[PDB]
Amino acid sequence: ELLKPRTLADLIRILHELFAGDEVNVEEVQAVLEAYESNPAEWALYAKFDQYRYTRNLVDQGNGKFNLMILCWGEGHGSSIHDHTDSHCFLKLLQGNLKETLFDWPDKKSNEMIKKSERTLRENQCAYINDSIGLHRVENVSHTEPAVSLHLYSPPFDTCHAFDQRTGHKNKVTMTFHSKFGIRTP
Ligand SMILES: [Fe+2]
């Protein structure tokens, strides 16, 4: 029985319930994430920005069944084109807007990766991606407004691939956390 999360803490409690088992009801998880109304006071602790690139701030480690983190995107900050390491990935906007661009998995041939689609993710909206859907890039294209997003990955992963848009070639990257549970982790 899915109820509206009253607070971020309440959302986290609900997520522990939704991930108690071995599988993932994606539509239910997405619905609960969307239903949480972002309250900046509840997540200010995690919203640690860096001037030069977006930061990943760990919020909850789940049951070891998911990583829940907050990403802080300065004006103009964006990600690589990347995959999600055979995991579910939910992305909910807490503040601002992000542009998501979708790409197909490349062929062996070196070739320009052409976008398949793009969309604008707005405050409180939750998006979902997995490797079967494709690859994506996420960017804060705003010149004036930082963006903050809440990401849930299951199972947790600490590596993924970045793809070179000009060729489709991939390289493995290790994800690092800017902070964990509100504590800067240099
Ligand atoms: Fe992603």
Swiss-Prot record:
One of its GO terms (molecular function) is nickel cation binding. Binds 1 Fe cation per subunit. Ni(2+) and Zn(2+) can be used to a lesser extent. Its EC number is 1.13.11.20. GO terms for cellular component: cytosol. Its cofactor is Fe cation; Ni(2+); Zn(2+). Induction: By increase of sulfur amino acid intake. SUPFAM superfamilies: RmlC-like cupins (SSF51182). The keyword Oxidoreductase applies. Pathway: Organosulfur biosynthesis; taurine biosynthesis; hypotaurine from L-cysteine: step 1/2. It is an enzyme of class 1 (oxidoreductase). Fe cation binds at H82, H84, H136. Gene3D superfamilies: Jelly Rolls (2.60.120.10). Pfam families: CDO_I. Monomer. PANTHER family: CYSTEINE DIOXYGENASE, CYSTEINE DIOXYGENASE TYPE 1. Catalyzes the oxidation of cysteine to cysteine sulfinic acid with addition of molecular dioxygen. This is Cysteine dioxygenase type 1.
